[PDB]
Amino acid sequence: MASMERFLSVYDEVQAFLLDQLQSKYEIDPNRARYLRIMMDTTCLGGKYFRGMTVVNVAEGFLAVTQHDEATKERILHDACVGGWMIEFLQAHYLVEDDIMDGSVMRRGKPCWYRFPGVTTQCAINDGIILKSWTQIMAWHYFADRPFLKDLLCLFQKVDYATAVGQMYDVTSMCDSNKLDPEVAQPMTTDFAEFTPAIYKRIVKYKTTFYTYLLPLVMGLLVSEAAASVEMNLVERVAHLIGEYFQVQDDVMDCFTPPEQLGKVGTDIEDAKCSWLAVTFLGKANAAQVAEFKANYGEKDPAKVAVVKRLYSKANLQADFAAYEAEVVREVESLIEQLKVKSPTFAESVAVVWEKTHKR
Amino acid sequence: MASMERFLSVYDEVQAFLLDQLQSKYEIDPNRARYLRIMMDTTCLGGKYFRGMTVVNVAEGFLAVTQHDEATKERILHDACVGGWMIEFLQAHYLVEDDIMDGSVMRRGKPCWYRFPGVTTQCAINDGIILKSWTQIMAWHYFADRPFLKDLLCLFQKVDYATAVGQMYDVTSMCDSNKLDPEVAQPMTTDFAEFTPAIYKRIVKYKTTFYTYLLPLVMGLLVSEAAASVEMNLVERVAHLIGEYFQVQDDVMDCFTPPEQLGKVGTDIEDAKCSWLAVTFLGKANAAQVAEFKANYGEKDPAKVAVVKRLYSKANLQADFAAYEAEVVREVESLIEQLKVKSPTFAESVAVVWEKTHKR
Numbered sequence: 078m079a080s081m082e083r084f085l086s087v088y089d090e091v092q093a094f095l096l097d098q099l100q101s102k103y104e105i106d107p108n109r110a111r112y113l114r115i116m117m118d119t120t121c122l123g124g125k126y127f128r129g130m131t132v133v134n135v136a137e138g139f140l141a142v143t144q145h146d147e148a149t150k151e152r153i154l155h156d157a158c159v160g161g162w163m164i165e166f167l168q169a170h171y172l173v174e175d176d177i178m179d180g181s182v183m184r185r186g187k188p189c190w191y192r193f194p195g196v197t198t199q200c201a202i203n204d205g206i207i208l209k210s211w212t213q214i215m216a217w218h219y220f221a222d223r224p225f226l227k228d229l230l231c232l233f234q235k236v237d238y239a240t241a242v243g244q245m246y247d248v249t250s251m252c253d254s255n256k257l258d259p260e261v262a263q264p265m266t267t268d269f270a271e272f273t274p275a276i277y278k279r280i281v282k283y284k285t286t287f288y289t290y291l292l293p294l295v296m297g298l299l300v301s302e303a304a305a306s307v308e309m310n311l312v313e314r315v316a317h318l319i320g321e322y323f324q325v326q327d328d329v330m331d332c333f334t335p336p337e338q339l340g341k342v343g344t345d346i347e348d349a350k351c352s353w354l355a356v357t358f359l360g361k362a363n364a365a366q367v368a369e370f371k372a373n374y375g376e377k378d379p380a381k382v383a384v385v386k387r388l389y390s391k392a393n394l395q396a397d398f399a400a401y402e403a404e405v406v407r408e409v410e411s412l413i414e415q416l417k418v419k420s421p422t423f424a425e426s427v428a429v430v431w432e433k434t435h436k437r
Numbered sequence: 438m439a440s441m442e443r444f445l446s447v448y449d450e451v452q453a454f455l456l457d458q459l460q461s462k463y464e465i466d467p468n469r470a471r472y473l474r475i476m477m478d479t480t481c482l483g484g485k486y487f488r489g490m491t492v493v494n495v496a497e498g499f500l501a502v503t504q505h506d507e508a509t510k511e512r513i514l515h516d517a518c519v520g521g522w523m524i525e526f527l528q529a530h531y532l533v534e535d536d537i538m539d540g541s542v543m544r545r546g547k548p549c550w551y552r553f554p555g556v557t558t559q560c561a562i563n564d565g566i567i568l569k570s571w572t573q574i575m576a577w578h579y580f581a582d583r584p585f586l587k588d589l590l591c592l593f594q595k596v597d598y599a600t601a602v603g604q605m606y607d608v609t610s611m612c613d614s615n616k617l618d619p620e621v622a623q624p625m626t627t628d629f630a631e632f633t634p635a636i637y638k639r640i641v642k643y644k645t646t647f648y649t650y651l652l653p654l655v656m657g658l659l660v661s662e663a664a665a666s667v668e669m670n671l672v673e674r675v676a677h678l679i680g681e682y683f684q685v686q687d688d689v690m691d692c693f694t695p696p697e698q699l700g701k702v703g704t705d706i707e708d709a710k711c712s713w714l715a716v717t718f719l720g721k722a723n724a725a726q727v728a729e730f731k732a733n734y735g736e737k738d739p740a741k742v743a744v745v746k747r748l749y750s751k752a753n754l755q756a757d758f759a760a761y762e763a764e765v766v767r768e769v770e771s772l773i774e775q776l777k778v779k780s781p782t783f784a785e786s787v788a789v790v791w792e793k794t795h796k797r
């Protein structure tokens with residue numbers, strides 16, 4: 078049976094389970110169950126399922142080299158699918174809440190959940206809460222008797238937290254650290270001294286790479302009972318590295334990919350985000366160019382946004398991107414090689430993850 | 438050593454632990470650690486600690502009748518304090534998010550967190566996320582080798598979820614169920630057909646009683662390794678019952694307690710909430726009074742709010758409250774008696790919980 082169809086079948090299964098449990102144990106009525114069904118579908122479906130599918134892909138790699146009864150292979154694949162949906166639901170939680178936090182308008186070519194007429198922010202914040210609560214309901218139900226349950230829940234928990242930390246780094250990335258203070262309204266940085274590669278790296282590592290790369294890979298290992306086939310430090314390193322590249326690409330697209338293709342109108346410049354474009358620009362600009370950057374970044378005025386974009390064009394950031402890209406290929410390929418020592422199979426799964434990222 | 442001081446000491450311990458871990462494992466800088474310290478203090482401190490202290494109180498009851506080495510008694514009390522703080526942090530998560538959801542202005546005589554000048558909703562939503570993530574960080578760290586860890590995390594998870602469900606019942610309680618639809622903006626009910634005791638009960642059971650009464654009681658049992666000293670169905674029933682009473686009192690105060698004493702200006706009438714006052718009023722009004730209620734409820738206009746309040750005065754709701762109160766005393770005392778069969782000690786802890794609620 079093909080992996081994607083198995084994965085989508087399991088969504089329907091897990092959906093039915095969660096809604097049936099709301100009726101039998103939580104006293105839900107049909108109309109509220111309907112609203113939650115539609116919330117779940119709208120917030121969890123329609124992407125590429127790259128995160129969940131990585132759990133399945135890793136488990137399939139192991140199945141191909143490990144002896145098991147057929148019923149065990151099915152169990153492992155079902156577990157990978159459930160684990161994959163936990164990640165997808167974790168993402169949906171973060172996307173719902175982030176869109177509210179950021180006043181985002183669209184995502185993937187549709188309105189952000191909170192903007193649905195019959196949702197509103199008052200409901201949507203809570204809907205996002207439910208989303209993450211469902212990850213745990215899934216885990217406890219499907220993995221109740223599993224040897225890996227503890228390690229799975231502990232990892233999930235750590236990833237969730239790292240992600241929330243990352244969110245905090247992101248949202249505060251345009252303020253001067255020395256000025257953070259709950260009592261005082263936060264000015265945007267005037268010097269941009271904290272737009273550095275190391276600071277950027279910190280934001281990305283926490284905000285995206287743990288839930289997007291580290292969690293799918295490690296979850297695949299846990300449901301396969303294969304965590305002793307790998308050097309966990311290598312898995313972290315390669316996860317963090319591919320995750321960074323993925324975020325740089327997202328940053329480039331924010332600015333340069335036409336909105337109908339992006340799925341949204343990118344506002345990193347108006348939001349004064351610490352983007353790869355801004356850090357790399359500030360890494361290579363002269364005095365005049367910096368000054369011009371400072372006079373125009375982080376302002377809604379389209380004229381000012383256009384100055385910033387011109388600055389990035391003229392600064393020939395494509396060349397820095399290509400050099401960064403070349404470095405990431407060396408390092409990712411080196412890490413893949415190191416992974417081959419203890420597991421060629423897992424190395425290959427990582428190689429796949431990298432190809433899908435590198436040319437997407 | 439007195440329970441409250443032990444509990445507050447443990448807050449400082451757990452705080453230091455979480456911030457020290459952010460520095461050593463999450464790459465936090467001092468200024469962000471400072472912001473999180475201030476967020477934690479502002480959102481977790483200053484209430485009566487009734488929820489956390491119930492965990493400690495239950496554990497102390499058991500310690501008085503159970504043989505243990507001194508070091509075990511200290512371990513159990515430390516565990517109760519940590520467990521108690523998990524509940525307090527869970528509450529803080531919900532209060533932060535609820536205040537944002539509801540556009541609340543104050544709570545406990547201070548601005549809602551999101552309204553702090555240097556916070557804002559964009560940060561505050563995430564701060565609330567961190568709050569709940571810290572419950573799990575606490576659990577995994579302090580309870581790592583504990584026999585009760587699984588049962589504690591599963592219970593916590595279920596309570597969290599019940600609470601989020603309850604939030605959904607609450608926020609939707611002024612809409613007609615048959616009209617809920619993410620695609621369509623939600624009108625307020627014109628008939629108030631869903632303002633019934635059973636519907637009200639559902640909202641309260643989920644939104645408050647699981648995290649306010651059931652979780653502290655059961656957590657106390659788990660850290661004491663005492664869950665076989667009780668009939669769990671009785672614990673649920675008494676929890677749900679005292680929790681309901683607690684919410685009715687809160688509802689009465691929303692409307693009638695002067696704002697400097699309430700800590701906030703109550704807006705249940707303008708928010709068109711399904712309050713005990715509104716359900717009980719609709720339970721006893723004549724046609725004319727209902728009609729008047731319908732023309733004035735759920736409107737910001739102070740004139741209209743004042744009509745509703747007059748209606749409640751003239752309807753002599755104090756008498757229904759006293760009769761409800763009398764019924765709750767019978768039922769709570771009956772349940773306490775039933776609890777005495779398997780544990781007089783636990784019965785007494787529940788008796789305390791009830792006294793603190795009944796005359797607060």
Ligand SMILES: Cc1cccc(Nc2ncnc3c2cnn3C)c1
Pocket residue numbers: 273274275277278321353356357397398400401404
């Ligand atoms: C993650 C991050 C943040 C900011 C700037 C960069 N760019 C680079 N980082 C590392 N090597 C690089 C480059 C550009 N060329 N080469 C060789 C990376």
Ligand SMILES: Cc1cccc(Nc2ncnc3c2cnn3C)c1
Pocket residue numbers: 633634635637638681713716717757758760761764
């Ligand atoms: C939880 C709830 C919701 C709505 C109305 C009520 N009131 C009552 N519920 C039960 N017994 C009652 C009363 C009033 N008198 N007596 C005897 C309770």
Ligand SMILES: [Zn+2]
Pocket residue numbers: 175176178179247
């Ligand atoms: Zn964001």
Ligand SMILES: [Zn+2]
Pocket residue numbers: 327328331
């Ligand atoms: Zn982006």
Ligand SMILES: [Zn+2]
Pocket residue numbers: 535536538539607
């Ligand atoms: Zn609320």
Ligand SMILES: [Zn+2]
Pocket residue numbers: 687688691
């Ligand atoms: Zn209230």
